[PDB]
Short mmCIF file of C-alpha atoms (C1' of nucleotides) and ligand atoms in Angstrom, two decimals:
data_model
loop_
_atom_site.label_atom_id
_atom_site.label_comp_id
_atom_site.label_asym_id
_atom_site.label_seq_id
_atom_site.Cartn_x
_atom_site.Cartn_y
_atom_site.Cartn_z
CA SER J 1 34.33 -64.40 47.80
CA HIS J 2 34.86 -61.82 44.96
CA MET J 3 34.81 -58.15 46.24
CA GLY J 4 33.53 -55.63 43.70
CA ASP J 5 34.36 -52.08 42.85
CA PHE J 6 31.35 -50.40 44.39
CA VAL J 7 30.96 -48.72 47.73
CA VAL J 8 27.45 -49.05 49.24
CA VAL J 9 25.46 -46.14 50.85
CA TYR J 10 21.95 -45.76 52.38
CA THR J 11 20.08 -42.45 52.22
CA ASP J 12 16.92 -41.24 53.83
CA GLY J 13 14.98 -38.05 53.83
CA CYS J 14 12.36 -37.52 56.56
CA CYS J 15 9.81 -34.81 57.13
CA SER J 16 7.80 -34.64 60.31
CA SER J 17 4.40 -32.99 59.88
CA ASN J 18 4.61 -33.49 56.10
CA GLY J 19 1.66 -31.64 54.57
CA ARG J 20 0.84 -29.88 57.87
CA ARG J 21 1.31 -26.54 59.50
CA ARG J 22 5.01 -26.87 60.45
CA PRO J 23 6.95 -29.55 58.62
CA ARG J 24 10.57 -30.28 59.61
CA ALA J 25 12.70 -32.20 57.15
CA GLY J 26 16.08 -33.83 57.35
CA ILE J 27 18.43 -35.93 55.30
CA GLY J 28 20.50 -38.86 56.48
CA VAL J 29 23.41 -40.63 54.86
CA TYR J 30 24.83 -43.86 56.19
CA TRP J 31 28.14 -45.27 54.92
CA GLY J 32 28.63 -47.92 57.58
CA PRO J 33 28.82 -48.38 61.35
CA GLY J 34 30.52 -45.47 63.07
CA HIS J 35 31.65 -44.25 59.72
CA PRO J 36 33.03 -40.73 59.89
CA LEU J 37 31.02 -39.47 57.01
CA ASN J 38 27.64 -40.41 58.42
CA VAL J 39 25.36 -37.40 58.49
CA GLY J 40 22.05 -36.20 59.83
CA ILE J 41 21.33 -32.67 58.54
CA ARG J 42 18.42 -30.21 58.51
CA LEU J 43 17.04 -29.80 54.97
CA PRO J 44 17.39 -26.21 53.75
CA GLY J 45 14.37 -24.77 51.99
CA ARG J 46 10.84 -25.92 51.24
CA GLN J 47 10.06 -28.69 53.74
CA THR J 48 8.68 -31.93 52.26
CA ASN J 49 9.28 -35.63 52.25
CA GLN J 50 9.93 -35.64 48.47
CA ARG J 51 12.58 -32.92 48.68
CA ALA J 52 14.28 -34.52 51.65
CA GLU J 53 14.34 -37.91 49.96
CA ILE J 54 15.92 -36.41 46.81
CA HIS J 55 18.41 -34.24 48.68
CA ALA J 56 19.62 -37.10 50.89
CA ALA J 57 20.75 -38.83 47.69
CA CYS J 58 22.40 -35.62 46.49
CA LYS J 59 24.37 -35.45 49.72
CA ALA J 60 25.57 -39.02 49.37
CA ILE J 61 26.85 -38.43 45.85
CA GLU J 62 28.45 -35.19 46.82
CA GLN J 63 30.30 -36.89 49.66
CA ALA J 64 31.19 -39.72 47.33
CA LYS J 65 32.93 -37.35 44.96
CA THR J 66 34.67 -35.77 47.81
CA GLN J 67 36.46 -39.08 48.11
CA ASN J 68 37.06 -39.90 44.50
CA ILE J 69 34.47 -42.63 44.64
CA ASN J 70 32.72 -42.94 41.29
CA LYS J 71 31.17 -46.43 41.48
CA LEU J 72 28.35 -46.11 44.08
CA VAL J 73 25.44 -48.39 45.01
CA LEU J 74 22.81 -46.01 46.44
CA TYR J 75 19.91 -47.47 48.41
CA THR J 76 16.84 -45.26 49.03
CA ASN J 77 13.20 -45.97 49.88
CA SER J 78 12.09 -43.35 47.40
CA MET J 79 10.90 -44.80 44.09
CA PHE J 80 9.91 -41.21 43.34
CA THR J 81 13.58 -40.30 43.48
CA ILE J 82 14.67 -43.41 41.60
CA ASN J 83 12.12 -43.20 38.82
CA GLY J 84 12.63 -39.48 38.55
CA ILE J 85 16.37 -39.59 38.06
CA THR J 86 16.51 -42.83 36.04
CA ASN J 87 13.59 -42.18 33.78
CA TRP J 88 11.20 -39.28 34.10
CA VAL J 89 13.98 -36.66 33.81
CA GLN J 90 14.94 -37.74 30.27
CA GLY J 91 11.41 -36.97 29.20
CA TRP J 92 10.95 -33.83 31.29
CA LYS J 93 13.97 -32.37 29.60
CA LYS J 94 12.47 -33.11 26.20
CA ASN J 95 9.11 -31.50 27.02
CA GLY J 96 9.70 -28.39 29.05
CA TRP J 97 9.51 -30.11 32.47
CA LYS J 98 5.89 -30.91 32.22
CA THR J 99 3.72 -33.21 34.18
CA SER J 100 1.49 -35.95 32.87
CA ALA J 101 -1.25 -33.27 33.13
CA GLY J 102 0.76 -30.55 31.49
CA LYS J 103 1.48 -28.80 34.82
CA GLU J 104 4.95 -27.63 35.84
CA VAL J 105 7.05 -30.48 37.37
CA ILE J 106 7.18 -29.43 41.06
CA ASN J 107 10.61 -30.77 42.01
CA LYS J 108 12.48 -29.55 38.95
CA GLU J 109 15.12 -27.71 40.93
CA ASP J 110 15.69 -30.82 43.01
CA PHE J 111 15.97 -33.24 40.12
CA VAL J 112 18.19 -30.75 38.26
CA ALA J 113 20.61 -30.55 41.15
CA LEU J 114 20.56 -34.34 41.47
CA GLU J 115 21.28 -34.94 37.79
CA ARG J 116 24.14 -32.48 37.76
CA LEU J 117 25.59 -34.47 40.66
CA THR J 118 25.25 -37.75 38.84
CA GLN J 119 27.58 -36.57 36.06
CA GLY J 120 30.78 -38.58 36.07
CA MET J 121 29.36 -41.21 38.43
CA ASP J 122 28.45 -44.81 37.71
CA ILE J 123 25.54 -45.02 40.19
CA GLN J 124 23.45 -48.17 40.67
CA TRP J 125 20.20 -46.96 42.28
CA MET J 126 18.64 -49.64 44.45
CA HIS J 127 15.48 -49.68 46.42
CA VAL J 128 15.32 -50.62 50.11
CA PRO J 129 11.84 -51.05 51.74
CA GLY J 130 10.87 -48.08 53.91
CA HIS J 131 10.24 -50.34 56.89
CA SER J 132 13.40 -52.32 56.43
CA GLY J 133 14.86 -53.40 59.71
CA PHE J 134 18.25 -53.55 58.06
CA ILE J 135 20.82 -51.50 59.98
CA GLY J 136 21.48 -49.30 56.97
CA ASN J 137 17.88 -48.27 56.55
CA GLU J 138 17.33 -47.62 60.27
CA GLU J 139 20.46 -45.55 60.76
CA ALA J 140 19.82 -43.41 57.72
CA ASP J 141 16.34 -42.82 59.01
CA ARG J 142 17.59 -42.20 62.54
CA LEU J 143 20.16 -39.76 61.17
CA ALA J 144 17.55 -37.89 59.14
CA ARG J 145 15.39 -37.43 62.19
CA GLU J 146 18.30 -36.13 64.23
CA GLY J 147 19.09 -33.62 61.53
CA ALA J 148 15.51 -32.32 61.46
CA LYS J 149 15.90 -31.20 65.11
CA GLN J 150 18.47 -28.69 63.95
CA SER J 151 17.52 -25.17 63.07
CA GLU J 152 18.00 -23.74 59.58
CA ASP J 153 20.96 -21.76 58.08
"C1'" A S 1 -7.09 -29.77 32.38
"C1'" G S 2 -10.98 -32.47 34.95
"C1'" U S 3 -12.00 -37.03 36.89
"C1'" G S 4 -10.50 -41.71 38.26
"C1'" C S 5 -6.68 -45.26 39.07
"C1'" G S 6 -1.74 -46.96 40.36
"C1'" A S 7 2.81 -46.56 43.15
"C1'" C S 8 6.62 -45.42 46.57
"C1'" A S 9 7.41 -42.33 50.49
"C1'" C S 10 6.59 -38.85 54.49
"C1'" C S 11 3.22 -37.97 58.52
"C1'" U S 12 -0.76 -36.94 62.51
"C1'" G S 13 -3.86 -39.32 66.27
"C1'" A S 14 -5.38 -43.45 69.13
"C1'" U S 15 -4.68 -48.57 71.32
"C1'" U S 16 -1.71 -53.15 72.91
"C1'" C S 17 3.03 -54.53 74.74
"C1'" C S 18 8.75 -53.74 76.09
"C1'" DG V 1 12.87 -44.47 72.95
"C1'" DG V 2 11.23 -49.51 70.88
"C1'" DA V 3 7.85 -54.39 68.61
"C1'" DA V 4 3.19 -54.05 66.52
"C1'" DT V 5 -2.08 -52.59 65.29
"C1'" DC V 6 -6.07 -49.23 63.61
"C1'" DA V 7 -7.99 -44.31 61.70
"C1'" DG V 8 -7.07 -40.33 59.02
"C1'" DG V 9 -3.83 -36.67 56.10
"C1'" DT V 10 0.06 -34.76 52.25
"C1'" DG V 11 4.13 -35.29 48.87
"C1'" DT V 12 4.31 -36.29 43.96
"C1'" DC V 13 4.81 -38.84 39.91
"C1'" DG V 14 2.72 -42.05 35.82
"C1'" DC V 15 -1.42 -43.90 33.48
"C1'" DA V 16 -6.37 -43.69 30.92
"C1'" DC V 17 -11.00 -41.46 30.04
"C1'" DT V 18 -13.59 -37.35 29.40
N1 LIG H 201 -2.97 -46.01 46.44
C1 LIG H 201 -3.55 -44.66 46.61
C2 LIG H 201 -2.50 -43.72 47.24
C3 LIG H 201 -3.06 -42.31 47.40
C4 LIG H 201 -1.98 -41.37 48.00
C5 LIG H 201 -2.53 -39.93 48.09
C6 LIG H 201 -1.46 -38.94 48.64
N2 LIG H 201 -1.99 -37.54 48.69
NA1 LIG H 202 12.62 -42.72 53.19
#
RNA sequence: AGUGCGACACCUGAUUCC
DNA sequence: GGAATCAGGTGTCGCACT
């Protein structure tokens, strides 16, 4: 039936050895089977699961704009990313980016970059279970892992 | 802030099986 | 590589008491 106005995308950020001596992080964006915009890229910068998860969503939005898409359904496993961008950020901006314990919000730069990207976009953030066997979740994850094998720069 | 709790991720190691 | 299982870790946030 119907057919809406949204285009669906699955993102994933992975980080092998997260919290260990040599973490390797990547981002993956999946637009559909064999879709030309699918990507698996090495994450530039500080290597962590949280940053990768947030930056995978940035990448999706960025690509979305590249195509004049402005009604996007973005699935991610990261409630940290969802809650951050759809809730915590409003408050952080009104309190000097401060944690529940008054400490500096660690991923400020990441959430700032993400919010800037959301401008002009009607994004519906949805959650997909990390262990979802759905093709979208697996491919995004597989893509992230492939990206993390790349070197930086 | 300290402590505790909650939550979603990301891992590392073993074992079974394909 | 993959279907699971068990141990243990960090990434990071909110919350409530002290
Ligand atoms: N439900 C308790 C989860 C604790 C996660 C600790 C991560 N450093
Ligand atoms: Na994920």
